[PDB]
């Protein structure tokens, strides 16, 4: 049986439920090397999740699906045990292990839901090799349609709004917005950008590079200075690590703050996402379900001393760095998806099919 990754520090009072994991104690410490109880692709995936090597939502989903493809490839079957139920029976443990390494984000929820629905719905009347190859082809069809073609459809939808001269704003290493801006600057629309970034994971530098390598004008500034640049900003183009069942866009921990300061400066705030991330649950406030990273990465090297150098000793100092944050559906003015430029509050009525 796979162990339980032990927490690190003391979760803040309002987080007696969200675990606080560190990076140093990778769960692999208590597992064999010729990985026996689980499949080696699964432990490799969990281990490059833990060390924080696979960041974005689409990237996490793609890597997870490659892992599942591997698992299916080396799947075999116990005698007189139908593959239909048994594959899910053996895929739940790897999902719990990944949840231990780093809690399954929304994209992974949707992906594993799709794959489990597909496994349960393939008839027991198939040969091993044929069922496996069909499963792999279906996973590949998923990756092509839900997340690769969706990027093209979303770029074609978004290009009809990005006027000339307007300084679109972004946030964080969001694969879809970088793709949109590349594909809409290699079209002709001359604009600018103003990236907004957020410690402790300066995940803004990714989109900053991936943009300036493509000739786009840019500008970089940390998230607390947002309320400074917004007088000039003429759109906003956030990301979404989910869309909950009521339009409230879950994201990195700065998106709600940006949407709020944006509406307060009165600039349109058009989050763009793909139809697969739209989840089924719904949450209103930013605390019922989140993620808490290794807080020890907050400590910033100022002067000669990291100001939070020792952190555990002060029993009245408790750290947190939320990873997820919910912007409400009254600050969103657009949700661009392949199924249309749907508006904010009417995501569940129209994307639950």
């Amino acid at each position: 049986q796979v162990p339980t990754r032990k927490d690190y520090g003391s979760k803040v009072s309002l987080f007696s439920h969200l675990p606080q994991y560190s990076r140093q104690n990778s769960l692999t410490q208590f597992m064999s090397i010729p990985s026996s109880v689980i499949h080696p692709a699964m432990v490799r995936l969990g281990l490059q999740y833990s060390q924080g090597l696979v960041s974005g939502s689409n990237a996490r989903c793609i890597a997870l699906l490659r892992a599942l493809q591997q698992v299916i490839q080396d799947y075999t079957t116990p005698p007189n045990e139908e593959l239909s139920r048994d594959l899910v029976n053996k895929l739940k443990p790897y999902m719990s292990f990944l949840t231990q390494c780093r809690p399954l984000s929304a994209s992974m929820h949707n992906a594993i839901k799709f794959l489990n629905k597909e496994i349960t719905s393939v008839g027991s009347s198939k040969r091993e090799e044929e069922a496996k190859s069909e499963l792999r082809a279906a996973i590949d069809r998923y990756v092509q349609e839900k997340i690769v073609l969706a990027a093209q459809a979303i770029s074609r939808f978004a290009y009809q709004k990005i006027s000339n001269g307007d300084v679109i704003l972004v946030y964080g290493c969001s694969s879809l917005v970088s793709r949109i801006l590349q594909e809409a600057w290699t079209e002709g629309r001359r604009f600018r950008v103003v990236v907004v970034d957020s410690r402790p994971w300066l995940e803004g530098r990714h989109t900053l590079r991936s943009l300036v390598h493509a000739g786009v004008p840019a500008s970089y500034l940390l998230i607390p200075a947002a309320s400074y640049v917004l007088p000039e900003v003429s759109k906003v183009l956030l990301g979404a690590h989910a869309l909950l069942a009521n339009g409230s866009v879950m994201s990195r921990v700065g998106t709600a703050q940006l949407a709020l300061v944006a509406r307060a400066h009165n600039v349109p705030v058009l989050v763009c996402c793909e139809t697969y991330k739209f989840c089924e649950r719904v949450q209103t406030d930013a605390f019922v379900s989140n993620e808490l990273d290794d807080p020890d990465d907050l400590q910033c090297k100022r002067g000669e001393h990291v100001a939070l150098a020792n952190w555990q000793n002060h029993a009245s100092l408790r750290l947190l760095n939320l990873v997820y944050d919910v912007t409400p559906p009254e600050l969103v003015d657009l949700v661009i998806t392949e199924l249309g430029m749907i508006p904010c509050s009417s995501v569940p009525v129209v994307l639950r099919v």
């Binding site: 069942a245 209103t284 019922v288 569940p348």
Partner: protein
Amino acid sequence: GSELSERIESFVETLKRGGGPRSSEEMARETLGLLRQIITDHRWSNAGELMELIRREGRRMTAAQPSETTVGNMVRRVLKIIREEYGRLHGNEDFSFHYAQLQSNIIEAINELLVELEGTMENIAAQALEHIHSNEVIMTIGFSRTVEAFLKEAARKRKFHVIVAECAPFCQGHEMAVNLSKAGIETTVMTDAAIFAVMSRVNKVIIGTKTILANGALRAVTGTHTLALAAKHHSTPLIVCAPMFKLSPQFPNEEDSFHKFVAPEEVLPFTEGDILEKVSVHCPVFDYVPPELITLFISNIGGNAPSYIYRLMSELYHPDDHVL
């Protein structure tokens, strides 16, 4: 058999006099049991004649107590069941194309609906744990047995303060808070004259509701409008813990006697004296929460924004049954 006649008449009499039975789910279950009785003890062979029959009782009921939307929309839903099964079997005119097969199917569908209707508290209760993150201060109001079940289920794995206003016309918040504290929730009774002073210190506002209209706007036990208006001034997220049958398809100002005025004796008891000659005392029991203060209905299917509620009409009630 005239037994159905006497049963229906006793029912509407109880509805006019005083709530029977008390629990809203129990009234919906009773309405459905009666409606099933109609589909086993009357003369019909068509579907159109049965729709006229059901409308001929539903008009009487929804005009008995204009604030009993439970029985009204339950009749609407059995009408939708008739429409659906007749259309799927035979098929805009309804003809007596076929017979008892239809009635057996109707009884089966009503049994399924009634089974979904009797196990809804437990659904929302299992849906609680995801919402009540520990160390909240959940502000309810009044006494809504769904909200009490919700909270004393969620507090079996977490801990959170629970403010509870009491409805001042006649205090039932007291009994809710007593039932809560008998489960150890650290609750705080108070009169709802102080919904705005003790709101800044509230995290999430969990209110029941008597009836959800088709704007999302609801009709809930009084003083909940001002609670919602405060909890939107302080932009806390509302949670309207209402099962799916507390859902009438009317529209806000498409109903007269929206409220339900009760004997002004409770507001200014008769013992008062002479000054009861020149004072018009009003005791509105139900108040009209507009739909833009609410955030998240918690129905037996899951959470839903108000802007999804209209779709539920299109999936529960026929568009030509919004007049019963």
